Structure 1
Amino acid sequence: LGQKLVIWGTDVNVAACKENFQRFLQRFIDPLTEPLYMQRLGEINVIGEPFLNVNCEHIKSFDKNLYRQLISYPQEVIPTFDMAVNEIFFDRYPDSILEHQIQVRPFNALKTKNMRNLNPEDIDQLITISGMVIRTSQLIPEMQEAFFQCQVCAHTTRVEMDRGRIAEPSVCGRCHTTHSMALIHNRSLFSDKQMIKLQESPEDMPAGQTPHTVILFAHNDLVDKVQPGDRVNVTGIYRAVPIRVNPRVSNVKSVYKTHIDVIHYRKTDAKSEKRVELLKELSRKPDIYERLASALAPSIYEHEDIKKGILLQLFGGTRKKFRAEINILLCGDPGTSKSQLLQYVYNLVPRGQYTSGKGSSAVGLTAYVMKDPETRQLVLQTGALVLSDNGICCIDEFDKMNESTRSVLHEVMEQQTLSIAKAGIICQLNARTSVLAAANPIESQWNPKKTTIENIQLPHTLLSRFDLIFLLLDPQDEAYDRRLAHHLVALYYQSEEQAEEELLDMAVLKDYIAYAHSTIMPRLSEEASQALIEAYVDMRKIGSSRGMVSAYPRQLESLIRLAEAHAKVRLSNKVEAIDVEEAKRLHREALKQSATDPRTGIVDISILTTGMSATSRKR
């Protein structure tokens, strides 16, 4: 009987606790009006989730003693609260159906302890701690009901798990043969379980100390909700269990291993027609192209055409070998704005990636095969170019990638695939990634006596695959320096209003790009076709002088990509002469910056081969 039940050696009455929690559910209307948690139990009826999250601050404000009993004795109290919630969910809404009994999930919003100060006095208390997940194990199947069958006579029985053990039948009731009941593993019933290793956050550490870690266990319906690298305030019971000295011996070490029996996660670092009509109205705004290009990278100064090219890359061409991915190269001295621009723009798009061209990159450009450490089996770890299969890949310090990386990147940029024949695996992974690059000069400074390919020492076989190449060196003008200094002073005086304006611009920019990807598919108009043919023929007519080649058809395909991207920027859905002229302008400016021989200006052969005519005529 409920009224006779009392927590063991505790004098807390279970029925009183249940009724007090029901009173909390009934009366708590005031988080700052129906009760908040009865509103949530109205929502759960249609949402269908099997849990009710509740705030321990709310419980404490309603009743100090109930909160204290929850914190002190969660192992008994939380099942009591579950029974209370499942009674209320059929007192109200009595005709409802739900596949599982509701699980209450108490939590304090902030940490009650930090993991360095956990003590044995905290054992079996409800606590919550802040941390970062280091590793997350495979889904462990944990038994909850053992199904036994008689080997002789096929009689079956079911027995509950007591405290992890099984009360094996020892004799079959329907034929009385001893030791004849056999556990049928796949007829038994299992719940989900997973181990999570949690490290304290870096700011919480003492000065120069290595991290402490704690083990978490998350069970059914709360199992796979966290990933490595994320941050969480995790609420659970601080358990202490014995560990056996040897797997074949039941002696246990005197020192108990501890872990967190997880009850609630709260991720702390992860974060419509109105949106559609706002974006549609914004697409008709005058100079929307310049508006979006200026919204790109507010911290960076004056680089208009670079931002415009990055915008056209982020919008991309029309998908349908018909590669629509626009390739962009940034080129300039170390310490300049290109690295900051890459580190900004990679998080501005879904499916994006950022990596270094050097061997210290966390995720390499090439796919490889490794032994997964937690299980020591082979796993095909694909590279960043493959993980960014429909997004931008930001390759910083592009220039100094080794020859194998150069070859596989050439393969990716030309074929939009990455072939691997490593360890018996033979497969051709898709990589429709938009390569955005940042390349330094080989020496410490840019050399105006030399063109881009000779300064950066990259092959023409890679440089000719890029749609646009831009120079990020700064002028030596005192007006430029003074304007840059005023801009940097404004960045120093950046305040909350500028931050909110920049974040509003960032949000609408992300939404605009995603919507344009989702719905816009530009297609050629007749004037677009005539303009593109005219552009290619005109830029080929320059070759009448000196008998040189001044263009090649991949330039035309690049212009098609850029025009389609510009049409997608303004949500036209049909590409026409306005887009084609902007594509021509930006493309010609990129060639003017990149393909300029110092002796004669722009010359197209610099991209086709290294060593332009003014250099090669030494021999």
Structure 2
Amino acid sequence: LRIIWGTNVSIQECTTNFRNFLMSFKYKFRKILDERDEELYYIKQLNEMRELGTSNLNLDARNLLAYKQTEDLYHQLLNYPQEVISIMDQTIKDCMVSLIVDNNLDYDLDEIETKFYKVRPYNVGSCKGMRELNPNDIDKLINLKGLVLRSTPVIPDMKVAFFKCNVCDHTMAVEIDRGVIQEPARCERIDCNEPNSMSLIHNRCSFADKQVIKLQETPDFVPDGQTPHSISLCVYDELVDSCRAGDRIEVTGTFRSIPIRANSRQRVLKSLYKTYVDVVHVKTSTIEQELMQNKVDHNEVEEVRQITDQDLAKIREVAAREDLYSLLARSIAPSIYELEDVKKGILLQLFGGTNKTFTKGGRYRGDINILLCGDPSTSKSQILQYVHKITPRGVYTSGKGSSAVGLTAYITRDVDTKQLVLESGALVLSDGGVCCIDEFDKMSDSTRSVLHEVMEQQTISIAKAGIITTLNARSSILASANPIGSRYNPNLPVTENIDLPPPLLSRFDLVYLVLDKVDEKNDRELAKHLTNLYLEDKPEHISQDDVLPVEFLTMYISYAKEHIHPIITEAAKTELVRAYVGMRKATTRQLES
């Protein structure tokens, strides 16, 4: 049965096993799908391949699962990927050949068979994040997701080094293979001998780029308390550059780990190996694109795990609750007392607007920038806490702990590779979701110069340093401020009493002003709330008895986001105007808001 020494992978025997499957498939998948096209895909797809001649079969994984044979093949594949894929490719070429032979003369004629076709299997396994993985799996197919942080330029790789001799010269050149290049001392032509310097022409050596992508992985499903790990994957070959930064991509690849020399002078290696991803298939696949979507693209991941349909019903049910507009605002801040209209305006900030690209441009998004001030200790902090907690993409920052740069483009020295590396500052990150700004009134004048660009543009143009570009960051703005008073004090111009540029001021969507009338008569109540807990010391019954959702909220938010696209029609128009009329009777932006 031959073998592979440790792989327990019988040389061939899986070539048959596969060959059967490859030749014969149809949909056994529909069985797992429960069904509810007839023909086998593999042959057809493969023919398309032959005609187009694109090689690069990305397979499925799992079609094998579930099909007999190749059931085990699924397993061994997950286990011992590299060898497996090699065998796979071999069988593939052989099959292409055997196919052409059926066709007798095919594609003029036999060259194409000599060309290399390669497997780019995808969809392999449900992998739990990264941080989860054990050393137990050093090399396995693994699934990943999340936006693309940064990507190195192509880095050349001589599979084939290039050498020459002082004499005669002869140009012979050694392939790297294993990661060291062992050069011959002497000599080729003369040979001789002669201990004649064998020169290495670096301009003449081969180069692979296999590029480098800093990956910010979102597995979601966050066990906590972990913070998102960043990843880096070497790609290779045609895969290189096929990815724009920031893409949300599904890619699969081989777990990998490497030691790295510590001294940079001495031969010493660091033990404590450093892990990377080998990057097999992404989700050339680039050229294929929606040809991937063929076979229908896996029934859209079976709805992508939409809510308990029942839960959805619960949503649509709660929608009926007339109080819902209020009830939600209640559910929003359990800890916080009164100040509802705040909680409300925020709630809208969660529901904010709708994006419009026009024909092009357009792109008002849904963005809403709320500012709030008042007497301090308002809990004014606490809220930002809450939102930040809720907000998936949000970030919380302090005035003066800041300047116009840290929000963008650190462009720091990577120094891991001893490279310089572009680091998204705070804002680019915050693109999407909302931003939590402490001490807005206190920000550096340099800082917030940023803002006007953001607020207006809703994007950001950095021409600075090595790369000049306008990056889009779309995110909501929540800013806190203390009147100079710090009680803004009665009368005064409030607009004065807030400090700030009356323009930049005017920019903020929602201007919330907090104040205290000393309702006696409030403090009592607030003190009751507050005074509670107390009991229970172990957190229990915060707002009881009152009706509030908990996580249902989060989901509901998510769904409403996903599925809703309101359109005001004509109705609003009239009154809508009359309003802003009375207002200027104030600014247009007010209307826009």
Who is 1:185 aligned against?
202
**Deviation by residue 1:523-553 (Cα, 9 ceiling, x = unmatched):** xx9x99x9899768x72xxxxxxxxxxxxxx
2: CA distance, partners of 1:58 / 1:412: 52
Who is 1:588 aligned against?
none
Q: Which amino acid aligns with 2:87?
A: T
Percent identity of equivalent pairs? 29
Who is 1:143 aligned against?
158
2: CA distance, partners of 1:433 / 1:141: 36
Who is 1:30 aligned against?
28
- The answer to whether the 8 A contact 1:115-1:200 is kept is no
Return the offset for 1:110.
3.6
Who is 1:491 aligned against?
549
- The answer to whether the 8 A contact 1:239-1:258 is kept is yes
Who is 1:171 aligned against?
188
- The answer to whether the 8 A contact 1:355-1:364 is kept is no
**Deviation by residue 1:178-222 (Cα, 9 ceiling, x = unmatched):** 857654434433223356799999999999999999996543345
Return the offset for 1:62.
3.8
Who is 1:608 aligned against?
none
- The answer to whether the 8 A contact 2:146-2:217 is kept is yes
Return the offset for 1:21.
1.9
Who is 1:236 aligned against?
254
1: CA distance, partners of 2:191 / 2:370: 79
Question: Cα gap change, 1:60/1:372 in structure 2, threshold over 3 Å: closer, same or farther?
Answer: same
Who is 2:278 aligned against?
262
Who is 1:105 aligned against?
121
Superposition pairs of residues 186-585 of structure 1, within 5 angstroms: 186-194=203-211, 217-222=234-239, 236=254, 257=273, 259=275, 262=278, 264=280, 328-331=369-372, 333-334=378-379, 339=384, 354-358=395-399, 364-365=406-407, 370-374=412-416, 383=425, 394-397=435-438, 399-404=440-445, 408-409=449-450, 412=453, 436-441=477-482, 449=490, 453=495, 458=500, 460=502, 462-466=504-508, 469-471=511-513, 489-492=547-550, 503-509=558-564, 539=585, 555-558=586-589, 561=592
Return the offset for 1:30.
1.9
TM norm structure 1: 0.53
Return the offset for 1:376.
5.4
Which ranges in structure 1 are unaligned for 5 or more consecutive residues? 272-290, 517-524, 540-554, 563-619
Q: Which amino acid aligns with 1:403?
A: S
2: CA distance, partners of 1:238 / 1:420: 35
Structure with the higher fraction of residues in strand conformation = 1
Question: Cα gap change, 1:404/1:254 in structure 2, threshold over 3 Å: closer, same or farther?
Answer: closer
Aligned counterpart in structure 2 of residue 79 of structure 1, from 83, 86, 93: 86
Which ranges in structure 2 are unaligned for 5 or more consecutive residues? 33-37, 284-300, 302-321, 333-339, 530-541
Q: Secondary structure at the match of 2:161?
A: strand
Return the offset for 1:403.
3.2
1: CA distance, partners of 2:462 / 2:130: 49
- The answer to whether the 8 A contact 1:171-1:180 is kept is no
2: CA distance, partners of 1:114 / 1:395: 28
Question: Cα gap change, 1:561/1:100 in structure 2, threshold over 3 Å: closer, same or farther?
Answer: farther
- The answer to whether the 8 A contact 1:172-1:180 is kept is no
TM norm structure 2: 0.55
Is residue 118 from structure 1 mapped to residue 116 from structure 2 by the alignment?
A: no
Which of the pair has more CA radius of gyration? 1
Q: Which amino acid aligns with 1:356?
A: T
Q: Which amino acid aligns with 2:379?
A: P
Question: Cα gap change, 1:311/1:127 in structure 2, threshold over 3 Å: closer, same or farther?
Answer: closer
Question: Cα gap change, 1:256/1:408 in structure 2, threshold over 3 Å: closer, same or farther?
Answer: closer
Q: Which amino acid aligns with 1:140?
A: I
Q: Which amino acid aligns with 1:30?
A: K
Comparing 463-472 with 21-30, greater Cα deviation is found at 463-472
Q: Secondary structure at the match of 1:189?
A: coil
Question: Cα gap change, 1:262/1:396 in structure 2, threshold over 3 Å: closer, same or farther?
Answer: same
Return the offset for 1:79.
0.6
Return the offset for 1:177.
8.7
- The answer to whether the 8 A contact 2:409-2:424 is kept is yes
Superposition pairs of residues 54-69 of structure 1, within 5 angstroms: 54-55=61-62, 58=65, 62-63=69-70, 65-67=72-74, 69=76
